Amino acid sequence: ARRPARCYRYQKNKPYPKSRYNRAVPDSKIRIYDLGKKKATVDEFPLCVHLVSNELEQLSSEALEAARICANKYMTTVSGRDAFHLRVRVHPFHVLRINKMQQGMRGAWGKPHGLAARVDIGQIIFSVRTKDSNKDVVVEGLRRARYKFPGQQKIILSKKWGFTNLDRPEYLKKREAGEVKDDGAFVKFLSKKGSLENNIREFPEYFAAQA
Amino acid sequence: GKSHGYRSRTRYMFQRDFRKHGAVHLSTYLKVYKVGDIVDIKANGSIQKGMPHKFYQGKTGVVYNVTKSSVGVIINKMVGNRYLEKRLNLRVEHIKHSKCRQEFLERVKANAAKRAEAKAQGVAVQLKRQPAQPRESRIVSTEGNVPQTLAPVPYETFI
Amino acid sequence: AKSKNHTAHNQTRKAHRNGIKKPKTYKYPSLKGVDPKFRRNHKHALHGTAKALAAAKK
Amino acid sequence: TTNTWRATVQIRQKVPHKRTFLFLEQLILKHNAHVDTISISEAKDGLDFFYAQKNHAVKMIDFLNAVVPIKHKKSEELISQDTHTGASTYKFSYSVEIVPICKDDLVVLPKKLAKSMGNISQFVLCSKISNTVQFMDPTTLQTADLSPSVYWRAPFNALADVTQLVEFIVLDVDSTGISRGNRVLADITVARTSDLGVNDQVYYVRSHLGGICHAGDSVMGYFIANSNYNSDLFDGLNIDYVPDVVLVKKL
């Protein structure tokens, strides 16, 4: 079934998603995108690590599948299965075609082959949030996943708290007051606009000035 | 096969804008058109009668004829290696006055005022427009405004 | 064999050898395609003004 | 290497509404000549069958020759031509055409054709649509057959199709006599469904539908009085020997 991945490497054709014109397409190889303790609060896992791309390329679905298993298998055995939260930030929507076969070129439009992603320079692929002490396992976990993909990518330690869009000291300023409350997986913040009645329903620790 | 109908490739061109559907406002109908007036052609999609062909969307021309609920516009279309004089029949919904010519007639009244006032004042006119000239010298003070020193910043990631 | 179907290559180059020239305006355009009710009056207007100037400069 | 299947059967039919293809699709399943195909694709006026071996596709055409009127021909495409023998590697295509006259159509026959096959009238219904096509004359019960070889050499088309039928309501049936095999020649008195409610008008017509016709039954048929055809065969008729109303079937 599979051709070599070198053929469907570069972004040549326009985006060709599954719709009412394409209709009949095969299922994605990757299925579940979140792994580890995904019912964990925001306060548990501060230290964030990314796996950022550095090329304008196409990662296939089954390339992500093996990369997702390999990183999981190492990090589970070493540090235990509930010491992290892995998230895949790339979904394959682009359908690839194949000219599987009146004549050679006398009428030639390709059948659907398989799915793929479209990654850009500076785009994040993988993301892991963990404890402070358990850094080395996460960096070495994403090392082996780097081999399964084509092209060049680099691991980066983030300055932000977890998956939040807030810096290390910035999150502490707001959480020490009553300006943040936990949602479930992510988190909700106070806003200075809105109705003042239902701004007091939530955030009852704020509107006090004491502790 | 191929397809070249009267309204081919006009999906977005006779669309009605966002939150501007329904009946047209009445100043459209009260605007008076004489012969010799310059007019722009923009096709209202809600009215089907007296509609221009897609080519003439955007084009501008002169009025030559006035009738009951329409006007006669004359446009120059280029074809091959020459221009042909083409005569349209549009309803007033697909038309409006060109504001470029409105601006021009104001400048002629202004020139009549300048030349009449110049003779009463005492010679020297100068009425043509001049383009944007190169600017003159000056002395910029540093009082309460001393130059702040900048330099190129180092590289950081933040991702 | 198969041909080449279509192209617009060279066609602008050809067109600009001789102009792309304008169609020359005149004083008095043709009343071809003008309202018949307007023209049927305009005839009798110009007949009277000539007869007025002829009677004035008689 | 592109040329995978290595024999094709391109079946087709010139009619917009195909009864005979829908019949054929049902008939093929019963005896079950399909299995050897790699795959099936479709096209406007029929569908394509693809076979690995050449001898698998010939059994199908022999089977089709048995149950339906056809015309066909084969042509071939070359690929390799290996200089070591036993493998030149040709690829074959069989182009089959079903006869376009469906089971219940109204037909005008050609004059010479009509004189030969029993001296039957030119204005006829179809009967059975088997291996060969057979016609029936609704008024003076009669039958006549037409083989594909005799059809294709001088082809004609149906006057009006199943999509031209109109609903009538039967009031009485007066039997006259003959019954070769169907209790036939019933002088059916009928009135139109759009006419029964409003307006007074009645049509009275001899018909083959004698054994199964009862008063108050809705029957379908061709109503020839308001139809402007454009057939030259029909143009060569007797604008007055032609029946006003013909009823195709009960229901």
Added chain:
Amino acid sequence: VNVPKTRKTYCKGKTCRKHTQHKVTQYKAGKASLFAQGKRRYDRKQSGFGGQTKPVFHKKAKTTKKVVLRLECVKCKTRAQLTLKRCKHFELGGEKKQKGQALQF
């Protein structure tokens, strides 16, 4: 389609020149007739040895004729023709569309 029997339309018969009642009927052929100059010329050329001289049309594609309607002013009996679009069916009389009937039988 289904036109009515009567029609009030413009007659142009000298005394009329106005809207009047017209009886509507369907236009019909008119018989072939020999002694027409074409038929006379055809039969001359066709005689002798040579066989078929003129072409003979076969490849016909159209399935429906255009309808023509003979009108006739009841005041002066002066006829006029009027053509309709192509159609597989055609009649003229009653058979009007009702309020909103469902299917029966």
Added chain:
RNA sequence: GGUUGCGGCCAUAUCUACCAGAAAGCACCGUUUCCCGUCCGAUCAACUGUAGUUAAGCUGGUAAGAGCCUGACCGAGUAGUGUAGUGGGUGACCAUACGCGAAACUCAGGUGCUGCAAUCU
């Protein structure tokens, strides 16, 4: 300034929830002989300004309201893009030079204006 009739531009005029409205005007509101219309004087028609009301409609105000609108030493001279080189890079792509230059996001402010005619403690 308030209200009425006819408007122009068509949310700064809409939406949700509470509050106030002297004077006159709107309004609800009373009646079924007549013209008229309905399954029904509910709507529509006629008659009375009489028996009564600001409870609704309508006009204004409030809300760290939703929407909508204008801006900004907000983001961003970022994304993109026209032109140039015997520039880099195995490639994918990327820097530089001469120019043009967004949108989301962020912050601040606003919440109908106005024409003609009539009429009002």
Added chain:
RNA sequence: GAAGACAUUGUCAGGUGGGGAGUUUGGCUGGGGCGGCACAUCUGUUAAACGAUAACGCAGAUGUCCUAAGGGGGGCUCAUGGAGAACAGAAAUCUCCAGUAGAACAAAAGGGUAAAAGCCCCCUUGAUUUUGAUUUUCAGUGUGAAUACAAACCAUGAAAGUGUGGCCUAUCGAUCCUUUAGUCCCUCGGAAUUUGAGGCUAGAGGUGCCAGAAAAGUUACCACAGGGAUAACUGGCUUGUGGCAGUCAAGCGUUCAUAGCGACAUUGCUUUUUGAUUCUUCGAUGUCGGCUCUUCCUAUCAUACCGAAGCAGAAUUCGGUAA
């Protein structure tokens, strides 16, 4: 002798007649054939924000249907959700609140529309007559389709107004011949009357190969003019497929990732396979195999010397220098 107004012979008319004659046996096309129609048309996209734009590109439609589904006027609000009402339930009919269109508008798709262009009522033939101008495709020819007026005659509405078919973008056809309506007008040429025929102006009968021949096969017995504009074979470009080599390491190997093996993945080399292509050759480069004979390549089967092993010896297994 027989036969006899019958045969026979002559002219015309019907039947039979590959025994014989003459002719024909579409086009596009990743060679030709089969199929398809990209041959006349319409919507979205390809199409790179004026217009124009190709491929046997992609997703679909057309040869119809309609005296109302056409024209004018009046009344009214839809899809859906919520809350109620004996039989009655997820779905019957009735009531109220929400409801920017999430419905409907003959059919493909795209636009358009809310005191309507939707649903229900009243009245109607402007889907009429006379001919010119203009837009689209374009040679600024025809055909089809459409736009605005004019001169009549009408429809509807209290009225302003609206209406020359279907809300808009598709739904169709020359010369010759036949035939119909009109003028009931012109001509039949030595002069008349009546039949008949021929004209002038406007429609219909049709060419879907849609600017429009009247048309079956076969050649392995073949022929001519040409063509590398075009196939069957070497060579060239490419390397999907075939062949050969890496990287990573979940597992196998009693025990042990890597002695020897190795999944999911991913990076290459080769032209000893086969495709794709049509650049060279059709005034000819002799098209399979075997026999014979020389040389070159190494990705090493054996032979020389070595290194590993789950190598005690023997026998093997993996690798290096080497053609």
Added chain:
RNA sequence: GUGAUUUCUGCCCAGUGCUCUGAAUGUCAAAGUGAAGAAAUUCAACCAAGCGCGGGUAAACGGCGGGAGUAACUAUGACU
């Protein structure tokens, strides 16, 4: 047409041919006959062979299938 001798040469007349001491009112040219008309003409009836209908013919061209059953655990398919 088949191709010495030996021994055999099955079933099929629906199709295409060939045929016929068969049916008769279905189709049917020219000339001739009748009516309408001033006449040219038009319309009707009448009507040869052939065609069609019915029978014969395979050492004439040719063809010799398809779907179901039940008997011996099965099978074969004698049988329906």
Added chain:
RNA sequence: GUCGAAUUUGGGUAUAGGGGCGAAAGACUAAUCGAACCAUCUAGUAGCUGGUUCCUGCCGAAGUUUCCCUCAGGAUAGCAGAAGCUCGUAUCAGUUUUAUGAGGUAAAGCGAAUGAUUAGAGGUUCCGGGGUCGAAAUGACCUUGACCUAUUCUCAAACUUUAAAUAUGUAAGAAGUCCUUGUUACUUAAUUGAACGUGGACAUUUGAAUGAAGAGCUUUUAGUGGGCCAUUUUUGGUAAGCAGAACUGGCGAUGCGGGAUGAACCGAACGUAGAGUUAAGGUGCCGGAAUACACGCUCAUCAGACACCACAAAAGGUGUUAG
């Protein structure tokens, strides 16, 4: 092979070209046969191949539009020449500015409609179904999906509120502006307007920039209607010295210097000579020109060495150099 006959053979005689003869091969019929030979009709026709005869001077193309039993061809428009004619600072321009329109691509967006899509948290059950306690309940106690609330991960050639750059229409005055009061069957309640005028006022700062080997006009006729390459945009295809488009530049029709060599790359476009100067590219020797100068980096038991271009990757190295 056959050799006493269906044997072999001389002379005479008969059969003649759509005809003869044939124990049948399309055999033979005077070296000629799937239709002999000779003369004439005949210089038969060819959209097809080959050829087409002196010198210099000036100008100088096309492979594209529409229609054709059209696709190896024509007609038509285009590009080219020639002859001129009417006038003479002309009005124009493959250009910018100022003012003003038109557009739905790139980008962006989805806690905005449409469609796709990962995760939890809060709820809602008379209502898609199971279990736990049950005589049943429009019951509770657990549960997995459906919708509801505020969140969150990621997308769209045939989705979108917003929305560039480049390309694109018009205007920048004498054929103009203002005043005065004439014509009319059109138009208005109305000499009100409408259109075209009489008479008067306003001139070279007359109404942005730059340019202008003149501007405008007519007739007639050739060749051409196989194209190909390059940057950028691009659809088909795994790719191709592959197939098909978009804007510009080239080759074809073109030498000269450079890239060793080459239709298209860089430079630069040609009358015959002299002198000077440079382009692109170079200056160890071949070879005209510094074995110049300066700071560094590499040692290869396959070093490396100048765009288009004549290839190299993933992965590794206490090799050495900086961080």
